[PDB]
Amino acid sequence: SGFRKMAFPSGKVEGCMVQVTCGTTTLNGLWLDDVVYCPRHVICTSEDMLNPNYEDLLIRKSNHNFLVQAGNVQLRVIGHSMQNCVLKLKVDTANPKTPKYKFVRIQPGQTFSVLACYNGSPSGVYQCAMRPNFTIKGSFLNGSCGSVGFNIDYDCVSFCYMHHMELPTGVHAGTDLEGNFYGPFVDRQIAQAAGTDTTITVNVLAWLYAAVINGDRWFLNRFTTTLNDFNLVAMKYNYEPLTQDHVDILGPLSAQTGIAVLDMCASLKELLQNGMNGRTILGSALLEDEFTPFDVVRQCSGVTF
Amino acid sequence: SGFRKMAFPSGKVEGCMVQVTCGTTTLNGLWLDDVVYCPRHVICTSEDMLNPNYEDLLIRKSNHNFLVQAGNVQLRVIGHSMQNCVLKLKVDTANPKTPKYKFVRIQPGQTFSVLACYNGSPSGVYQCAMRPNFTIKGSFLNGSCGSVGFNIDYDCVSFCYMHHMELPTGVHAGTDLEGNFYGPFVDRQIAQAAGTDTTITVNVLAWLYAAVINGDRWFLNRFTTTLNDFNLVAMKYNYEPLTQDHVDILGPLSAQTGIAVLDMCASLKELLQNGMNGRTILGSALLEDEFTPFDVVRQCS
Numbered sequence: 001s002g003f004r005k006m007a008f009p010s011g012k013v014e015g016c017m018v019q020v021t022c023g024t025t026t027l028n029g030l031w032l033d034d035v036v037y038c039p040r041h042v043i044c045t046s047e048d049m050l051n052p053n054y055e056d057l058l059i060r061k062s063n064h065n066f067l068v069q070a071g072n073v074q075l076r077v078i079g080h081s082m083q084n085c086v087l088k089l090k091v092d093t094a095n096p097k098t099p100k101y102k103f104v105r106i107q108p109g110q111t112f113s114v115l116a117c118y119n120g121s122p123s124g125v126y127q128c129a130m131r132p133n134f135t136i137k138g139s140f141l142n143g144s145c146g147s148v149g150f151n152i153d154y155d156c157v158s159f160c161y162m163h164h165m166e167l168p169t170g171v172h173a174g175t176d177l178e179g180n181f182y183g184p185f186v187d188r189q190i191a192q193a194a195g196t197d198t199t200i201t202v203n204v205l206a207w208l209y210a211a212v213i214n215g216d217r218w219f220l221n222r223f224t225t226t227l228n229d230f231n232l233v234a235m236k237y238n239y240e241p242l243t244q245d246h247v248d249i250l251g252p253l254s255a256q257t258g259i260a261v262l263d264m265c266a267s268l269k270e271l272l273q274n275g276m277n278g279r280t281i282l283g284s285a286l287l288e289d290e291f292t293p294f295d296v297v298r299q300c301s302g303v304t305f
Numbered sequence: 306s307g308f309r310k311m312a313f314p315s316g317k318v319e320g321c322m323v324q325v326t327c328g329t330t331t332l333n334g335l336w337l338d339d340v341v342y343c344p345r346h347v348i349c350t351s352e353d354m355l356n357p358n359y360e361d362l363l364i365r366k367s368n369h370n371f372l373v374q375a376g377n378v379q380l381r382v383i384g385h386s387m388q389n390c391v392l393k394l395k396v397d398t399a400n401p402k403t404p405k406y407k408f409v410r411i412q413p414g415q416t417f418s419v420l421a422c423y424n425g426s427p428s429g430v431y432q433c434a435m436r437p438n439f440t441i442k443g444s445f446l447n448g449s450c451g452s453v454g455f456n457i458d459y460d461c462v463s464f465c466y467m468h469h470m471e472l473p474t475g476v477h478a479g480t481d482l483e484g485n486f487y488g489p490f491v492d493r494q495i496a497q498a499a500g501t502d503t504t505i506t507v508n509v510l511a512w513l514y515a516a517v518i519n520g521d522r523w524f525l526n527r528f529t530t531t532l533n534d535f536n537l538v539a540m541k542y543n544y545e546p547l548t549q550d551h552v553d554i555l556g557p558l559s560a561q562t563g564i565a566v567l568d569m570c571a572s573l574k575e576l577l578q579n580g581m582n583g584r585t586i587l588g589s590a591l592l593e594d595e596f597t598p599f600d601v602v603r604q605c606s
């Protein structure tokens with residue numbers, strides 16, 4: 001029993017984190033095989049960040065403009081390359097701790113673990129969701145750039161996120177591991193704002209199912225809504241629309257609990273209009289939306305890696 | 306910026322987790338040097354649940370009654386001893402992944418990370434706190450016994466909790482790594498309720514300091530309070546008493562924010578009286594008590 005915001009075991013990823021320095025800038029790198037990956041803005045000065053020409057800033061650099069430390073060992077950079085907003089430093093040594101891995105791009109509403117790092121040193125791990133507005137609500141300080149987000153499937157690490165910047169509202173923006181930004185953001189020191197965020201409806205429903213599985217039942221009722229009716233309510237409360245794929249994904253949870261999805265939508269519909277009436281759900285006074293249906297199934301069934 | 310409940314990176318603990326089997330009971334063990342630590346109720350049958358005589362059950366076992374598996378490798382047990390409620394299995398191979406470690410007993414309100422495991426394999430990591438009633442509000446299924454709680458400071462893993470059991474109310478009880486239970490609980494299935502779960506006041510105050518650090522001031526007010534008047538009020542909401550020790554501990558956060566500890570106590574008194582009124586603090590709509598003063602300094606600076 002119990003339900004916690006649970007991150008993947010981070011050991012496979014810890015063994016890949018290194019420190020990258022260029023000029024006065026130090027941030028984190030991801031060392032896989034004989035390549036180190038880091039944000040391309042490591043090559044920028046404070047003046048460069050205002051309007052950078054990355055290809056030109058990089059032509060003017062050599063392999064020895066890059067100091068790469070793996071713990072107490074210096075890694076020799078023998079080549080450098082840029083792929084979108086990510087810098088690729090070839091090194092002379094393969095990482096012997098390189099796990100089975102792949103680079104994947106996730107969809108908003110999907111969750112992953114972030115291994116927050118500083119000077120190549122892992123400091124903490126936390127679970128989060130990619131917001132519908134493509135930001136993540138992270139916890140990062142100066143020096144956390146280059147920290148990565150990931151999922152684990154069996155023994156394979158799926159790297160999905162690399163941290164690049166903090167936005168003026170305090171939320172965070174980054175890229176996949178092939179350097180493509182998530183969201184309408186650029187790696188440039190200019191005014192940028194994320195769009196209005198919304199709540200991940202299908203995740204809230206999954207969390208209500210986790211609540212039922214753990215004995216929290218007060219929000220259930222005898223009623224049912226329709227997808228049409230609910231989505232009109234959802235739109236009003238800045239909730240993501242619920243699709244037929246969402247209902248199918250919640251299928252297993254509906255089977256295990258005996259609460260059909262549109263029954264739960266009726267519960268959620270009532271929770272949105274009337275609130276929580278001074279009660280909590282799984283120790284929260286808010287509707288939690290950073291658990292996917294798959295998260296709920298895994299945590300409540302005890303899947304290992 | 307931002308504030309999340311971060312756990313410690315789990316890699317150093319992952320390299321210590323093994324599977325321990327005795328009879329038909331299988332749970333997790335912690336493999337450090339040539340010793341595997343696990344809950345002693347691994348040696349129990351269904352007929353032993355109510356009044357197990359552990360000394361009697363153990364004397365009847367030989368080394369080969371214990372199957373220890375590290376990954377695919379079976380480890381040979383060459384000796385066993387019991388220390389309080391923890392079994393210590395001597396194995397013929399030292400764990401090459403053994404980190405720098407120590408065993409620490411923590412006090413209520415302290416936080417730590419849990420590496421939840423089943424069959425010797427990690428499922429996930431999460432952060433939690435020792436409640437004032439000496440339980441933890443974990444996430445644990447059958448087969449999770451032997452999972453451990455830990456902090457990491459520099460490169461030293463301080464193990465502070467080994468999971469033993471889930472109480473009827475859904476909360477969790479365990480021991481330190483010397484096998485002494487936290488709280489009044491025992492490893493048999495007789496009735497034992499946990500005391501009233503109270504709120505960890507010193508942690509709530511530290512988290513409010515974290516909110517001011519991160520730019521949120523809406524809950525402050527122009528009042529102060531005496532320590533005694535604060536405690537007379539807060540204890541009516543089932544908050545733990547705040548001691549002068551706690552006040553001293555909050556001193557650094559007070560100095561950083563310019564808000565006196567007793568002034569923040571005044572803000573907390575008003576928050577208990579008013580609630581949030583539709584607002585949030587650091588993304589929560591409740592007062593959070595699982596961040597210590599030490600944690601707040603750690604994540605904010």
Ligand SMILES: Cn1cc(-c2cc(-c3cc(Cl)c(F)c(OCc4ccccc4Cl)c3)c(=O)n(-c3cccnc3)c2)c(=O)[nH]c1=O
Pocket residue numbers: 001329330331332346445446447448449450469470471472473491492493494495496497
């Ligand atoms: C055979 N067997 C047993 C276990 C196992 C044993 C226990 C467990 C162990 C001991 Cl000694 C107990 F006195 C105990 O009393 C529970 C209780 C009942 C009624 C009143 C008060 C109390 Cl306290 C429980 C357990 O609580 N859990 C568990 C389950 C869910 C989450 N967390 C922990 C699991 C196992 O994992 N593997 C395996 O093979």
